[PDB]
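Subject: complex prediction, re-run

Hi both,

The earlier run crashed halfway through, so I resubmitted it with identical inputs.
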Amino acid sequence: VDDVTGEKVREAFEQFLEDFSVQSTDTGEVEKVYRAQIEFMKIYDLNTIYIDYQHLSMRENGALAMAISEQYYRFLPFLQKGLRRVVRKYAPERVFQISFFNLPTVHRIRDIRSEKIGSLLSISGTVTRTSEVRPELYKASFTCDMCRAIVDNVEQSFKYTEPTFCPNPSCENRAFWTLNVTRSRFLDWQKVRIQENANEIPTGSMPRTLDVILRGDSVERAKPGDRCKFTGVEIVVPDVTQLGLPGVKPSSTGVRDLTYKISFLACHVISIG
Amino acid sequence: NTEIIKSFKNFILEFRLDSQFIYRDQLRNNILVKNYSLTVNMEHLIGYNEDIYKKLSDEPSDIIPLFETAITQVAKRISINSLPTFQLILNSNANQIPLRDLDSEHVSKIVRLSGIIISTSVLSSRATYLSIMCRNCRHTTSITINNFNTGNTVSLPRSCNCGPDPYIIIHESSKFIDQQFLKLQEIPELVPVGEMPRNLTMTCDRYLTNKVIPGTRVTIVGIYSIYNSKNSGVAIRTPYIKILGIQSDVET
Amino acid sequence: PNVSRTIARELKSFLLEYTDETGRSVYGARIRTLGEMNSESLEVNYRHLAESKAILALFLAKCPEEMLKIFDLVAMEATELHYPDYARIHSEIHVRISDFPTIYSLRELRESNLSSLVRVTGVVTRRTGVFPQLKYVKFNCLKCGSILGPFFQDSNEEIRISFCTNCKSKGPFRVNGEKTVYRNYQRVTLQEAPGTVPPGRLPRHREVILLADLVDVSKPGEEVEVTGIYKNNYDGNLNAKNGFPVFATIIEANSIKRRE
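This time it finished cleanly. Structure:
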């Protein structure tokens, strides 16, 4: 089902960058620029790409980008596997991040609504109160009671938990959340608070904010107080601290209520303005 | 534990300078006034025997509560009902350790030093001998604590099964003592040119309370010990000096 | 590994047989300055070792947490041919690796500089008091005896070494105050120097652990140059943040230089 159409967006994207999306010849951009973008990262090894959004939508006439604009969150397992089938036919300690840019529209803070969860969009704002750079886990090696410390798979999510199946000892799913730093691959991120631009808003009534996560190789590119555009994803984060203004928050029948709020994720930041 | 009493019980009875012997005349004149203590000069231990002071200098926390029961077996050779546990107060003069250089090596060692006292506290109560009864079994017992190492080193047991800690302290038959909790600042003539003057906190036992006013120059002989309350780090303890014998000057 | 015995005999010749500038081997005339100050610290330059053997210069930047133990264990038996009665004065020497220019000011610390020797300058902001640390976890098991052998929890880790099947079954263990070797401890933070700031940005903090010799070497307001290592401290790392598995990073110091 989703495995089927997940390979279709995989094989189309794998067939996309193997072909060229640039027409003007004899003045640059000749013969599959994305193959030429690979070899420059083969010399330098910074593990990223910077591909256009319009250039994806020019070939199939938006037959593919409308899914990538809508169901963007589900396809990053399938876009990462599709890129890794390409470079192993090209290039011989590796991780890869897929950055987009050149979007048609710029949205604002007041137009943020929950019909666009897992989609792609841009936003402009003012950067305030940056923080420090810290590692995040993203892959664990949690051992067990027996000497088999084999743990390179499950529970890389946003919960800091360890796995349940494939038991090393003869026991069941024992205690969890162990991170043995001998083999675990951390990336770095920081947290900033974006604020709406001054010369758009009406009469001054404390304009609303967000908190944005900058993952990967985008760190310390946000200056304290300059305007920027960003990438599309809009996650929601489980939190505990929201209390005092109650609604109908559904319970979990270990009892725990669920409180949600909005947080923004990025992959490419551009400092226009 | 065994027979180190008799190696000290002969020290009180038989120590003797030229004509008049001291520790059977200091033990008798401190009972008629009802004073209940003793003052050992620490040079007279090592002149009489070196093997005794070898044990006392190595592991002092387990042997001074053995000498306190070696006195109260001698005061029943003089008085013949209520004779409590005696207290041992000692003083000497080897070499002052300044307050700035107290390393991690001097844990549980006899250390003397000097300084100025800043503040005191209000008195309190510590228990020595208490009586316990269980709530369901009602099996009475008696725990006698004599050692002092501040929070908890000796506590209630777990069974005489019955529940988690079924024991109650009975307040109608016990004995209690005092504690004082001073503070001590180093002398400003060992000047901290780029530092502030540090400080330590001591404890005092039953017969050294209310002896010193804030603002004096003292010399203090004690055990540099450690305690682990959380009242800022991982596996971090805190230092304090269990005073046994404050040799102040003339108060002036 | 078990290749360490090949390492032990072959850096020992660079404590005795490394000479320079017409005799006077600088690490034969260095152990004589131990003892007469009695200080358990060997100074070792990095340029004086990298020019001879380029193999071990790589094995300092790769994993110095297991490399420096072997570099300390044979460092005892270099002094023992000079001072044979040195088992009883601290019984231990740790080492003092000199300059290795990795990080420029403060802010180049990514994943790619993890668990490696980093050299960094800064300014001391504030510092705590001096405390003892355990360094020797000694149990209080009720089934076994209360000596029980020396076990090591000497990190920022606080190891969950449970006592199971000690004498006949799992005896309940605590800690006592008996016969263990404590050592000093003092946390001092450090921020970026005001001369080499980029325009506009605030300076950044970092926590530095000192250990057992280098306490009371700082004073608040000094241009200090730390040559520590860089690890991934657990034990309360963002306790209210479990949706973001974000770890705390503390530099454990290995040397301290003043302003130059």
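Chain A has two domains: 1-105, 106-136+184-237+261-273.

- K.
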